[PDB]
Amino acid sequence: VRKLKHHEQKLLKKVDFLEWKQDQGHRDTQVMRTYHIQNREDYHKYNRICGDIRRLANKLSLLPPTDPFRRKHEQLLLDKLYAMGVLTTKSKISDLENKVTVSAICRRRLPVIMHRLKMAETIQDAVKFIEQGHVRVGPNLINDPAYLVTRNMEDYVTWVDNSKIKKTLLRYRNQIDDFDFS
Amino acid sequence: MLRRQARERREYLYRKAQELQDSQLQQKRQIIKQALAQGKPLPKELAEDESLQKDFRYDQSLKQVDDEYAATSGIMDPRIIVTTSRDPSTRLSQFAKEIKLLFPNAVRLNRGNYVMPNLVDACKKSGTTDLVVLHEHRGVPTSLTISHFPHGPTAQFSLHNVVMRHDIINAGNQSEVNPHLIFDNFTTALGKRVVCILKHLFNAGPKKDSERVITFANRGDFISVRQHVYVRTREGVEIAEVGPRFEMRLFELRLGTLENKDADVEWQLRRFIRTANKKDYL
Amino acid sequence: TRKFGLVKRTLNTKKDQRLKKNQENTRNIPQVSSALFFQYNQAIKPPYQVLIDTNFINFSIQKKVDIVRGMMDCLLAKCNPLITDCVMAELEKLGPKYRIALKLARDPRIKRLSCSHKGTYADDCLVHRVLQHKCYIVATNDAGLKQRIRKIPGIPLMSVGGHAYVIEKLPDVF
Amino acid sequence: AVPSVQTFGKKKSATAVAHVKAGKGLIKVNGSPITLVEPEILRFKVYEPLLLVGLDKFSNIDIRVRVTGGGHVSQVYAIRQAIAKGLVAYHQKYVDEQSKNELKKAFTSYDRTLLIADSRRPEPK
Amino acid sequence: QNDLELQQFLRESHLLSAFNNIVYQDDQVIGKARSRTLEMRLNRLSRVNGHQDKINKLEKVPMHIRRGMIDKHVK
Amino acid sequence: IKDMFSSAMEVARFEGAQIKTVSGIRGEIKRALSKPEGHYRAAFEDKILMSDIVILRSW
Amino acid sequence: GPYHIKYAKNGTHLLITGRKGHVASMDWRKGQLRAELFLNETCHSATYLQNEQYFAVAQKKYTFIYDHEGTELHRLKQHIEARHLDFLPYHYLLVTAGETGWLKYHDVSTG
Amino acid sequence: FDRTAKPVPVITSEVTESLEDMIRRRIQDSNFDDLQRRTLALSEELQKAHSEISELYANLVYKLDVLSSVHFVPKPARVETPTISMEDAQPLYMSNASSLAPQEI
Ligand SMILES: [Zn+2]
């Protein structure tokens, strides 16, 4: 579309082919670009899970404050989300509405975990290294980039053995032992 | 385990970092709770802070042992390893045996050629809660270090006036019962911290008839440690000294284990401040 | 062979020029006037030229001070009173309660001065005249315009105070 | 680029690094022949990786060992561990897996500390 | 008039009537009644020391929508 | 520290005293050295220099 | 395959859509490929909007709107399981019908 | 001259007696700063709110377990009787004795 003239813009104020109100600012596309999300529906599945969390938090808030049921369930939810890694802290109840985002879940995906662990320089590099078969979480090889890492499961995200990446880093430090297969 | 302990240490330090802002928001919420209870006007900043008032509908249901000791306070009994400096004398070995007998779940371990980073790792993988290291100057014990695991506080005490059971007692054996503890004249937050550290070396819930009493009494930043045996006569309680007597002085408290020298200092003794004489910190 | 990390092409709202927000995406230090000493305007001399503001006329009528005669008594010199187009437009917008002020502004001893700006805002118009040329004396009783003229160096300020006009920041008036 | 292998051996503060490449039979430790490794009384500890499997296994390779740290005993044990592991790794990389498995069986039957590091860490009771 | 819970109950008697379709006590009141009564109390406390512009600010509504809502409410 | 005192008895009367450096570094007399006689051990809040002079203020 | 085809109202552009997600927009008389998408998904229909510059594809659940080069502009959450697409060129209305039994008219100019 | 710090206090008869009298008093009062062992009717509208929150919590924790759980996640869900009745429906059986123990009868 060419640039509208002045008299045309007044008659065509609402016209926009690229930004619609139902797009919600292309927040989904922004988040997928930040965390290299490949599947299109991943943001919306994550958003539905966040919506369940926020709906439950709203109901617990509408419960009376000095309710043992309310306090127990809010602490249960805070502990569960913190253990998964979605919540950075357990201090505030209000984080169950303010700090539950899609990006918070996407920061627990495997390439973001590797990039934070300095295993890969970019999230896209981490994605490619995952699909190329270099990454194991424990004994198990993970070639799915969408795999979500728990706080406990962070400690076993490591390079697979016989990896050219692992041999390269050992050879850089001059600590490569070929008996160990490197 | 190498990756687990570093990650948990990072999470612990992050909690210590966020604790200040959490406390500030706590006082901002406490004004609202008092204002709602008393019908008192709010200040201007809390009146115009719309986000805090919107979050108060969630945070209205928020309400003590320390963070390092919170997970297992009263659940699992401690395991203490009592060790000495590198080449202990016979008198230091005797005092180490005495301190081991003072604590109810403590084993005395030969130092030998043990490196402190290797000893701390061994303690961590073996699951001991506490490590106590004893120092001396020609047979006289001068220093006592208590370090909590896996990343707990490390407190260092200067021992004075040390008298041992091998000297005073000609005969008799220690009762080795879960004792009754007496913490006296600990008022400040540093005193509460020292009380927590010293208290959690002992087993939870001694039974009522226990005749052993261990006393830590604060006199002018000096902690007198006594061990006594009581018999409940109808006239009163008579007291027998049954253990070592010493005065201990906290001079350094660090937020890390014994191996770490880069650990943050919770408290340090400052000898050469101008007004050092006036204050009593414990 | 296929590339790795394949993603679906979508709209980059940060960097697409078709969007309006991305579509939107020498040094001048003016010289100090040679009419001025450090705070003293030395070029100015009689006959002075006095830019009148609307409330100056209104307070002149309330205190029954003649405009030309009162200015001549205040300055002890001949003056040229100038009313700009925006000032006359403000007096005309003031309505039917101020037709006396309108007529006393229409008095032919007051010389008109054309404006080539959009809108009718006497404050910015007079301040722009002042910031350009140092030959004017600003007659006003508005507090904000008084503060602006006081901040501008080398510019005399006239006001209606009490029985007659009072001058300020003109060293010649004794 | 010749076929070559790098392996490590440890005993306390001692560390030995063995480079096993294609060669003719040169077995050198710290730029010196293996037959000058001191002490005399412990030279057969260094010799025994060679003697368990035979010198024919060494007929076509060159071993070069650089050792730092520790004392005489620790360095001897580090040397022999590095040489045994380098033999196993070279015979797995450029010779057959059957040769590798037979070497590993011989070394394990004699002394596993030739292959796996002996770590005397403390055990609290 | 110095008493608090009586004046609060009188002020919030309309909300409790609207949403309880008594449960006036804070440890019993649940749901929308709890939310709106907390909002009323907080707004009342904030009114005296908060600037009115920053205290009461309407939800953004298009002109024709808000004018129609006002006209129907006034009817 | 040397030259402040002439014997360990003189040191032992003044043990525990505040001392300071011309730089301004504060310290404490701790113990009397056995040999030679007038010397003593002192603890300061920082490392001091061989160019420094230690002073004790009395009346 | 199979391929559902659509022509521009000029007839200068052709928009093919395979059932297995291969959607292509071309200038068939010039032999010039404007866009080509491999969605790896079930696709039922496609239509052009007011030009060849925009086109709508009825995919597995939601209907998507792409530009001339092939970038996704919109994902219409309100249009669910549409099998039939249409465009009213004077009203700028994209009309979707499908498995749900709901007929939906969407203004492509305002959204 | 000014001294930098208080000397280490000496233990004397009066100090020991004061300490022992404090210990005696706290034993008599039984005040002991011991570590204690840590352990281990609503209304119809409140019951309905609790039931709704319980259902929502069950579904949410199921979906979070599906996200983070290493294995497959199942969906969230004694009278006297013969044990052959407690079995599944098939021609055979393996256990005969009734469910209740003699001590339970
Ligand atoms: Zn003008």
Side-chain angles (χ1 to χ4, degrees), chain A, chain B residues 1-168 171-233 236-282, chain C, chain D, chain E, chain F, chain G, chain H residues 1-77 81-105:
Chain A
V1 188
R2 60 171 189 71
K3 183 205 311 180
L4 297 190
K5 267 167 278 163
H6 177 273
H7 71 108
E8 313 196 288
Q9 205 269 350
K10 303 282 202 184
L11 291 172
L12 295 178
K13 280 165 167 180
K14 312 288 275 315
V15 162
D16 200 2
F17 291 113
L18 281 73
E19 289 258 1
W20 291 357
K21 196 159 303 184
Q22 66 99 35
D23 299 331
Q24 296 167 201
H26 290 73
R27 182 65 69 74
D28 51 355
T29 294
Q30 203 204 310
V31 171
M32 310 195 328
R33 277 170 178 282
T34 302
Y35 300 115
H36 208 79
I37 295 162
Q38 299 164 302
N39 217 49
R40 267 294 303 181
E41 301 296 324
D42 277 1
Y43 181 94
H44 304 289
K45 299 172 171 173
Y46 284 152
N47 208 12
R48 287 180 188 239
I49 284 172
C50 295
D52 313 335
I53 299 173
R54 293 175 77 177
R55 173 174 45 235
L56 187 63
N58 176 65
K59 293 292 176 66
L60 289 161
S61 301
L62 296 184
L63 278 194
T66 64
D67 203 350
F69 188 94
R70 161 181 179 164
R71 300 190 154 172
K72 155 200 176 187
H73 281 244
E74 288 168 324
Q75 293 284 340
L76 281 171
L77 203 51
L78 277 168
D79 289 30
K80 170 75 172 170
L81 288 177
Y82 175 80
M84 301 175 58
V86 183
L87 293 175
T88 61
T89 61
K90 281 175 300 175
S91 281
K92 285 196 308 172
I93 301 299
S94 297
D95 286 2
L96 291 175
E97 190 94 9
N98 307 347
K99 298 266 284 202
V100 289
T101 58
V102 180
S103 293
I105 312 187
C106 296
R107 284 191 228 100
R108 301 312 304 190
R109 291 161 69 97
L110 190 51
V112 192
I113 288 300
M114 291 169 62
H115 171 60
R116 279 214 287 283
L117 281 184
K118 269 75 177 172
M119 274 169 85
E121 271 166 340
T122 66
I123 296 181
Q124 189 187 349
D125 266 326
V127 165
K128 302 172 184 175
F129 289 161
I130 287 163
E131 321 195 309
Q132 275 149 57
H134 289 302
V135 189
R136 51 179 272 250
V137 183
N140 302 113
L141 186 139
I142 305 287
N143 65 326
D144 194 6
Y147 165 82
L148 189 148
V149 186
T150 310
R151 273 192 198 283
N152 183 46
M153 281 335 287
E154 281 178 42
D155 317 315
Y156 323 107
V157 176
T158 177
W159 291 121
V160 75
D161 50 352
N162 297 286
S163 173
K164 285 198 186 167
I165 290 183
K166 198 179 176 181
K167 296 182 187 181
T168 292
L169 56 87
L170 286 168
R171 200 184 323 274
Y172 169 73
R173 294 276 173 181
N174 270 318
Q175 286 162 0
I176 184 167
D177 197 340
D178 289 328
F179 181 77
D180 298 333
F181 274 82
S182 55
Chain B
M1 183 179 72
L2 265 189
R3 279 189 51 161
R4 185 187 278 298
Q5 302 280 16
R7 190 203 96 236
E8 276 180 355
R9 184 190 161 87
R10 287 183 334 108
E11 290 176 359
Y12 165 68
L13 296 187
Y14 183 77
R15 290 193 299 273
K16 303 279 275 199
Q18 304 307 119
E19 190 276 331
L20 183 63
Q21 291 88 17
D22 291 330
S23 71
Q24 271 193 35
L25 275 179
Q26 204 156 302
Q27 291 93 22
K28 287 182 171 177
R29 268 172 289 171
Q30 280 282 350
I31 303 170
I32 301 184
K33 281 174 181 174
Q34 294 163 4
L36 277 175
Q38 309 175 309
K40 185 193 140 292
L42 276 167
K44 178 181 190 64
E45 66 274 14
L46 303 184
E48 301 181 351
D49 195 7
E50 293 179 353
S51 58
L52 186 60
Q53 298 185 12
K54 264 149 59 195
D55 293 330
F56 189 71
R57 187 273 303 278
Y58 290 72
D59 283 326
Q60 209 183 3
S61 70
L62 276 164
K63 317 173 82 92
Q64 159 76 13
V65 293
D66 290 300
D67 168 21
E68 297 93 3
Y69 294 83
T72 187
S73 164
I75 292 172
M76 291 166 318
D77 291 331
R79 284 161 100 221
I80 308 147
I81 295 196
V82 181
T83 184
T84 65
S85 62
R86 177 64 74 95
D87 281 297
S89 62
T90 56
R91 205 161 181 269
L92 189 66
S93 305
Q94 292 181 8
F95 192 58
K97 193 185 182 64
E98 286 194 358
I99 297 296
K100 158 219 171 185
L101 292 164
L102 192 76
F103 292 110
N105 290 138
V107 295
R108 190 263 184 276
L109 165 79
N110 283 321
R111 177 68 185 280
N113 273 294
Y114 281 160
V115 194
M116 209 46 80
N118 295 354
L119 181 60
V120 165
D121 284 331
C123 286
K124 284 179 183 185
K125 73 154 187 175
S126 177
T128 66
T129 65
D130 291 279
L131 179 60
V132 177
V133 190
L134 305 160
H135 297 285
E136 52 88 12
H137 168 37
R138 291 187 54 173
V140 177
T142 65
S143 170
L144 190 147
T145 311
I146 306 167
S147 176
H148 183 80
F149 288 123
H151 64 279
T154 298
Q156 311 178 16
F157 299 91
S158 185
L159 307 183
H160 311 93
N161 297 331
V162 178
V163 180
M164 301 185 247
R165 198 188 322 122
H166 295 279
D167 297 8
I168 48 170
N173 287 358
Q174 188 170 358
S175 310
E176 271 196 310
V177 186
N178 212 357
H180 277 294
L181 301 179
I182 294 176
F183 289 92
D184 184 33
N185 206 358
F186 294 95
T187 59
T188 64
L190 190 65
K192 306 306 180 186
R193 193 80 152 121
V194 167
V195 159
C196 196
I197 291 171
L198 287 179
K199 180 184 297 181
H200 277 103
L201 290 150
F202 295 88
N203 300 358
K207 188 269 183 182
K208 176 171 46 48
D209 70 352
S210 302
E211 294 90 2
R212 288 181 71 233
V213 163
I214 295 178
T215 314
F216 311 89
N218 187 9
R219 312 279 175 260
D221 291 331
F222 277 71
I223 302 168
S224 300
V225 187
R226 302 297 185 251
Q227 189 191 174
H228 295 285
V229 166
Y230 70 76
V231 176
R232 281 182 179 269
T233 307
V237 286
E238 68 274 16
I239 294 299
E241 175 79 43
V242 74
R245 305 145 70 258
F246 55 98
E247 301 293 328
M248 84 199 302
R249 194 211 201 151
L250 176 80
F251 62 92
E252 184 178 1
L253 180 48
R254 296 192 84 117
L255 299 185
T257 46
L258 183 62
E259 65 183 1
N260 194 8
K261 304 292 171 203
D262 286 358
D264 303 358
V265 189
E266 185 166 342
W267 188 82
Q268 215 161 10
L269 180 74
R270 268 87 180 186
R271 282 288 284 232
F272 317 104
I273 294 171
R274 200 193 74 85
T275 74
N277 300 294
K278 304 183 188 295
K279 202 158 181 166
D280 273 338
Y281 295 87
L282 265 177
Chain C
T1 45
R2 304 155 45 197
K3 264 312 310 183
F4 293 83
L6 301 174
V7 285
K8 178 180 185 166
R9 295 178 67 247
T10 43
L11 192 65
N12 191 358
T13 46
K14 296 180 157 195
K15 305 202 203 93
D16 214 315
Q17 289 182 175
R18 302 175 281 174
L19 294 181
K20 314 192 181 323
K21 52 182 198 67
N22 315 331
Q23 213 174 10
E24 289 180 352
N25 195 3
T26 199
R27 195 162 22 101
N28 173 65
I29 312 181
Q31 65 183 177
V32 183
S33 173
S34 49
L36 267 69
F37 209 56
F38 287 85
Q39 283 284 290
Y40 161 59
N41 179 25
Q42 64 215 19
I44 192 166
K45 65 180 182 292
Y48 305 109
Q49 313 214 110
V50 185
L51 294 169
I52 315 175
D53 188 20
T54 62
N55 63 6
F56 193 80
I57 312 172
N58 303 331
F59 285 126
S60 303
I61 296 173
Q62 293 180 356
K63 271 93 170 191
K64 285 168 185 165
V65 185
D66 194 3
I67 287 183
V68 174
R69 207 171 321 294
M71 281 196 220
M72 202 155 308
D73 294 23
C74 165
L75 294 171
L76 289 178
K78 211 167 269 295
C79 75
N80 304 347
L82 308 172
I83 281 180
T84 69
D85 287 5
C86 53
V87 164
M88 201 65 108
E90 281 197 339
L91 281 162
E92 271 156 40
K93 283 180 173 191
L94 275 174
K97 301 186 179 180
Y98 294 80
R99 299 145 51 239
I100 304 191
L102 183 63
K103 182 156 165 298
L104 263 71
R106 293 286 180 87
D107 185 322
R109 303 177 299 171
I110 318 184
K111 324 302 301 183
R112 302 272 279 104
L113 198 60
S114 300
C115 288
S116 65
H117 62 83
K118 270 190 188 173
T120 64
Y121 200 50
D123 300 337
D124 292 319
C125 182
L126 291 188
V127 163
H128 290 167
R129 298 285 174 87
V130 162
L131 279 166
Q132 263 294 300
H133 311 113
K134 302 302 167 181
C135 54
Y136 297 115
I137 299 186
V138 167
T140 185
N141 279 63
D142 186 74
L145 195 58
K146 267 180 181 173
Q147 298 315 116
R148 298 179 72 176
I149 294 308
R150 278 155 182 168
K151 290 175 182 188
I152 303 162
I155 305 297
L157 181 83
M158 186 175 304
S159 299
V160 193
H163 65 279
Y165 301 153
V166 293
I167 202 61
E168 156 170 4
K169 284 194 301 151
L170 189 50
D172 186 74
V173 172
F174 207 71
Chain D
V2 291
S4 66
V5 173
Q6 193 199 245
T7 51
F8 296 87
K10 304 188 186 323
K11 179 65 193 308
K12 295 174 170 172
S13 282
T15 300
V17 176
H19 283 85
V20 194
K21 69 158 194 174
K24 38 190 169 167
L26 281 173
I27 321 181
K28 313 213 71 182
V29 181
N30 283 303
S32 190
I34 188 154
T35 72
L36 308 183
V37 169
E38 291 289 319
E40 271 285 310
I41 196 67
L42 290 180
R43 194 165 301 178
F44 292 99
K45 308 280 290 173
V46 165
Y47 280 155
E48 64 193 2
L50 291 83
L51 295 177
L52 284 167
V53 295
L55 303 192
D56 62 358
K57 308 289 182 313
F58 296 79
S59 167
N60 277 320
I61 63 167
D62 273 358
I63 309 193
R64 215 182 42 72
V65 178
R66 271 282 312 149
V67 188
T68 81
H72 315 293
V73 184
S74 285
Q75 281 191 357
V76 160
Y77 280 84
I79 291 162
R80 59 195 281 286
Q81 171 162 74
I83 293 179
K85 292 177 42 164
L87 211 57
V88 174
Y90 187 89
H91 287 101
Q92 83 164 120
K93 199 161 178 182
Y94 313 102
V95 195
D96 54 291
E97 183 179 1
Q98 192 63 50
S99 70
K100 181 253 293 183
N101 294 352
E102 288 165 7
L103 293 196
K104 255 168 54 187
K105 195 184 199 46
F107 290 145
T108 306
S109 283
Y110 189 76
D111 196 8
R112 216 179 162 231
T113 78
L114 286 163
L115 289 189
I116 185 73
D118 190 61
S119 62
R120 316 215 188 185
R121 304 161 85 274
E123 321 305 300
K125 49 187 177 179
Chain E
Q1 293 82 17
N2 189 359
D3 182 29
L4 188 71
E5 69 275 16
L6 169 58
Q7 301 304 120
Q8 259 169 19
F9 175 63
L10 289 156
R11 282 193 292 264
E12 309 153 353
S13 61
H14 301 286
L15 285 191
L16 299 177
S17 163
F19 298 124
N20 278 351
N21 189 359
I22 199 65
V23 177
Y24 64 113
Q25 307 272 28
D26 60 340
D27 73 41
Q28 293 179 356
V29 60
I30 66 176
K32 267 192 188 167
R34 180 203 182 283
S35 158
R36 301 268 288 260
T37 42
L38 181 55
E39 201 155 59
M40 185 180 288
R41 291 163 186 178
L42 281 173
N43 185 337
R44 195 166 200 285
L45 295 187
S46 66
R47 185 179 296 113
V48 59
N49 288 318
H51 201 173
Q52 313 164 357
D53 298 331
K54 316 175 73 43
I55 286 300
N56 43 67
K57 184 166 167 175
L58 305 188
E59 180 193 297
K60 184 178 182 179
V61 186
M63 211 206 308
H64 49 284
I65 305 187
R66 188 182 266 130
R67 286 198 50 93
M69 291 155 68
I70 292 184
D71 291 331
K72 213 184 183 178
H73 196 236
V74 162
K75 286 182 184 178
Chain F
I1 310 296
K2 68 171 188 174
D3 292 351
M4 201 158 258
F5 298 112
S6 69
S7 68
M9 315 265 296
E10 270 184 297
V11 179
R13 180 171 287 177
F14 285 86
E15 278 180 8
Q18 290 175 357
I19 52 178
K20 76 163 155 192
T21 300
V22 165
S23 299
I25 310 176
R26 290 175 295 218
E28 162 178 3
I29 302 179
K30 292 282 188 181
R31 280 267 305 188
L33 268 65
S34 315
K35 296 183 290 294
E37 262 285 348
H39 307 271
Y40 64 92
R41 190 186 74 194
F44 295 82
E45 53 187 0
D46 204 351
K47 207 195 65 145
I48 62 160
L49 259 58
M50 291 275 318
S51 72
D52 282 340
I53 298 170
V54 191
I55 53 176
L56 163 53
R57 177 175 75 168
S58 64
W59 306 97
Chain G
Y3 284 81
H4 162 94
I5 71 155
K6 188 66 195 180
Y7 272 98
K9 317 269 182 181
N10 300 10
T12 70
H13 284 68
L14 159 73
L15 188 60
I16 61 169
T17 298
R19 195 56 43 76
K20 283 163 198 47
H22 172 229
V23 181
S25 161
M26 69 216 76
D27 198 302
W28 62 283
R29 65 182 181 179
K30 276 185 183 174
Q32 193 65 33
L33 186 67
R34 307 304 182 190
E36 196 191 4
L37 304 168
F38 285 104
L39 303 169
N40 303 303
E41 198 190 7
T42 304
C43 287
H44 304 95
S45 175
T47 183
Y48 273 121
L49 299 197
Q50 78 271 28
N51 297 115
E52 79 274 2
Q53 300 281 296
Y54 306 89
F55 59 94
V57 187
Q59 309 189 189
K60 185 182 164 182
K61 195 182 177 188
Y62 301 111
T63 307
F64 291 73
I65 292 176
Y66 305 89
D67 64 342
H68 57 286
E69 175 155 30
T71 76
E72 183 179 1
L73 306 173
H74 311 292
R75 165 186 164 280
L76 316 179
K77 40 181 179 186
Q78 284 145 332
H79 302 260
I80 292 163
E81 278 197 358
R83 302 286 178 265
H84 311 291
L85 295 175
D86 211 332
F87 194 71
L88 311 182
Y90 296 98
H91 305 77
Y92 273 67
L93 286 180
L94 167 83
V95 193
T96 73
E99 292 289 329
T100 69
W102 284 69
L103 190 66
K104 302 206 179 189
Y105 301 77
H106 204 104
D107 193 291
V108 301
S109 50
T110 69
Chain H
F1 54 97
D2 286 307
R3 278 88 165 184
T4 175
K6 291 189 178 181
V8 161
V10 292
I11 300 310
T12 45
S13 62
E14 41 275 40
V15 169
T16 306
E17 280 295 330
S18 173
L19 211 53
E20 286 199 0
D21 275 292
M22 181 265 308
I23 296 168
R24 270 194 266 268
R25 184 171 330 300
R26 297 201 67 169
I27 291 174
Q28 293 179 356
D29 296 332
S30 88
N31 194 2
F32 283 126
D33 303 275
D34 286 329
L35 202 54
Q36 293 179 356
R37 203 175 326 274
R38 178 129 62 79
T39 185
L40 313 175
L42 310 161
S43 76
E44 60 183 1
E45 57 167 351
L46 199 52
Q47 284 159 5
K48 289 173 172 179
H50 288 182
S51 311
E52 186 193 5
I53 291 189
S54 303
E55 183 178 1
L56 261 57
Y57 178 73
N59 303 354
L60 181 55
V61 74
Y62 168 72
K63 297 180 67 177
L64 292 182
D65 284 0
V66 168
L67 283 173
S68 58
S69 168
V70 59
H71 282 110
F72 179 94
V73 185
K75 64 171 186 177
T81 187
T83 309
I84 190 167
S85 281
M86 311 185 48
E87 290 169 352
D88 291 18
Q90 46 95 37
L92 270 62
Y93 66 94
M94 61 175 217
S95 61
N96 213 167
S98 75
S99 167
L100 289 196
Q103 45 258 55
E104 293 158 0
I105 294 191

